[PDB]
Amino acid sequence: PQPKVLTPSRKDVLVVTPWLAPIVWEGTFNIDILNEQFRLQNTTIGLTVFAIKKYVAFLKLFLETAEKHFMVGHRVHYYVFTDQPAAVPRVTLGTGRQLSVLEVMRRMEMISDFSERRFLSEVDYLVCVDVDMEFRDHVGVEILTPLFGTLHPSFYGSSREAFTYERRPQSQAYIPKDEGDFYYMGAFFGGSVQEVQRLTRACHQAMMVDQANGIEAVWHDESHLNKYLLRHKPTKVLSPEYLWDQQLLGWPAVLRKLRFTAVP
Amino acid sequence: PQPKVLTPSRKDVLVVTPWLAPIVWEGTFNIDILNEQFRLQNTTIGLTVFAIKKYVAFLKLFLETAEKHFMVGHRVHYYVFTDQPAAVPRVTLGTGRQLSVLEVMRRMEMISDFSERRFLSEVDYLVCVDVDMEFRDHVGVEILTPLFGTLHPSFYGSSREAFTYERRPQSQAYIPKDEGDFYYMGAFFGGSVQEVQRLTRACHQAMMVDQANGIEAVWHDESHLNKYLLRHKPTKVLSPEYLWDQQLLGWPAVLRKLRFTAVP
Ligand SMILES: O=c1ccn([C@@H]2O[C@H](COP(=O)(O)OP(=O)(O)O)[C@@H](O)[C@H]2O)c(=O)[nH]1
Numbered sequence: 169p170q171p172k173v174l175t176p177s178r179k180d181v182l183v184v185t186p187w188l189a190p191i192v193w194e195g196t197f198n199i200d201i202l203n204e205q206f207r208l209q210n211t212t213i214g215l216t217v218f219a220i221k222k223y224v225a226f227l228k229l230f231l232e233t234a235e236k237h238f239m240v241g242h243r244v245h246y247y248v249f250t251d252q253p254a255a256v257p258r259v260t261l262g263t264g265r266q267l268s269v270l271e272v273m274r275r276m277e278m279i280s281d282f283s284e285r286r287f288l289s290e291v292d293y294l295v296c297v298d299v300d301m302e303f304r305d306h307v308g309v310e311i312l313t314p315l316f317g318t319l320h321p322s323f324y325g326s327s328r329e330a331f332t333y334e335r336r337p338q339s340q341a342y343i344p345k346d347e348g349d350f351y352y353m354g355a356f357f358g359g360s361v362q363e364v365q366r367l368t369r370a371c372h373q374a375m376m377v378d379q380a381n382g383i384e385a386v387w388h389d390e391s392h393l394n395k396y397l398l399r400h401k402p403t404k405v406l407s408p409e410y411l412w413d414q415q416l417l418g419w420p421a422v423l424r425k426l427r428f429t430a431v432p
Numbered sequence: 433p434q435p436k437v438l439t440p441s442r443k444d445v446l447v448v449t450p451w452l453a454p455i456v457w458e459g460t461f462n463i464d465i466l467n468e469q470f471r472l473q474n475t476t477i478g479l480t481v482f483a484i485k486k487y488v489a490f491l492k493l494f495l496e497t498a499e500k501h502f503m504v505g506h507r508v509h510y511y512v513f514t515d516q517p518a519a520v521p522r523v524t525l526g527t528g529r530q531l532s533v534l535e536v537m538r539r540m541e542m543i544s545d546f547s548e549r550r551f552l553s554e555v556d557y558l559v560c561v562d563v564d565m566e567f568r569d570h571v572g573v574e575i576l577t578p579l580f581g582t583l584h585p586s587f588y589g590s591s592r593e594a595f596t597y598e599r600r601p602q603s604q605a606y607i608p609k610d611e612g613d614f615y616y617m618g619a620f621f622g623g624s625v626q627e628v629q630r631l632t633r634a635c636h637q638a639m640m641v642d643q644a645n646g647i648e649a650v651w652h653d654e655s656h657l658n659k660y661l662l663r664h665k666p667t668k669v670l671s672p673e674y675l676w677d678q679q680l681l682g683w684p685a686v687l688r689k690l691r692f693t694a695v696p
Pocket residue numbers: 217218219220221222223297298299300355
């Protein structure tokens with residue numbers, strides 16, 4: 169179809185940030201056009217996931233649903249970080265899709281180390297998510313951009329003084345009470361390999377300083393992620409369609425699709 | 433202020449294309465944030481303008497108004513292409529701003545040649561406009577992106593079969609009747625130096641082929657510009673606030689600012 173300049177793509181939600189980064193909601197994008205632009209570059213997407221201790225139990229559904237909904241038609245490489253390589257279930261993968269097992273403050277440190285490895289040279293973007301989740305609907309190249317965060321589903325409706333940023337000024341994650349654009353969740357972020365290198369390195373180095381000063385930020389790496397994305401603004405922001413909990417929050421009308429949701 | 437996820441930045445216009453490029457309207461951007469991000473990189477903007485024959489008469493107002501409204505606070509280098517160097521008026525410039533005179537199918541060919549010169553090595557973005565115009569209001573770094581076009585003020589409300597694309601299939605500028613996103617005007621386009629190299633080279637090479645085949649596209653380089661931007665989609669699109677004619681079109685309510693307008 170033809171975009172119509174005089175008709176809003178959505179009349180109920182903000183679809184662009186004040187720094188002109190798209191906020192990704194159903195009805196904002198034509199997936200056919202995006203798929204073509206990304207296929208033209210033979211894009212490869214790395215997906216990182218941690219499954220430590222009892223969390224290995226979530227991988228089977230996480231992977232099977234990824235195969236149905238995540239970047240289908242594109243090249244995908246899953247990187248599973250685990251303390252149990254033998255517990256990784258053997259999930260059949262579509263063509264162009266691969267999985268590697270990496271045996272293991274941790275997430276940022278580890279992604280930062282892995283992100284700098286030469287075997288990542290084929291990969292174009294990295295997407296970093298929680299494992300206690302399942303895909304229910306399309307998650308595709310509409311998310312891909314140099315740097316993106318995701319709105320925490322519990323705060324997208326909130327004002328900034330209510331955001332659980334780190335408020336102690338001795339913490340590297342410190343954000344003053346009248347500062348802040350959005351509250352991003354540490355459960356889904358990513359960007360090009362270079363931007364994810366920069367982000368995870370910055371968060372890891374900041375946390376190290378906090379540790380050397382006897383402070384642990386209130387929400388741990390998520391606090392440092394919010395500090396980083398305040399100072400280095402994401403080039404796309406994912407709407408809560410991309411990170412949801414239907415048991416705790418239902419299915420409000422503003423969410424036309426629930427794409428990637430908590431497992432009960 | 434704080435962006436509010438549940439409140440549209442505009443309820444009367446489309447603010448993002450179906451490929452997630454921002455469409456730049458007043459109320460979509462916080463200029464303070466954009467100015468800071470661009471100052472952090474010490475951005476230099478080149479502005480190209482042609483003033484041939486009687487058109488040299490428009491430079492004095494074009495330049496004086498540019499100095500009031502165009503990229504103020506950033507580094508700017510005007511490139512005036514003229515058959516009359518002595519007719520270039522001597523306009524006083526703000527700090528960080530410079531002007532060069534270049535003595536002269538033409539616009540694309542010439543920008544393409546100039547855009548590949550090494551003396552452009554300081555410049556980060558190129559903006560290419562008509563000279564029979566004046567700035568009335570802010571035109572700033574909100575436009576800057578790898579590739580942008582501007583909606584032709586006469587067609588932003590139209591359907592695509594009404595767009596004056598080149599319709600003969602022997603022309604390189606050929607666009608089929610059920611294809612097309614927008615009709616862009618050849619009076620205001622730009623992007624990073626590299627994307628403007630690519631665009632002007634493509635349009636110039638396409639026109640050369642049309643000439644070698646005894647065809648002139650209906651709207652000349654604007655036809656080839658539309659063909660190029662159909663196949664290589666702009667990363668921002670400027671709303672008609674950025675290219676207007678108040679004598680012919682008035683001041684409709686959807687235009688909250690008239691930034692860059694035709695001289696009567
Ligand atoms: O014992 C654990 C605790 C956490 N995690 C990983 O760290 C993420 C964050 O924990 P939860 O998912 O427990 O955190 P929120 O994402 O903080 O609910 C999980 O998704 C897993 O990917 C893990 O693998 N094993």
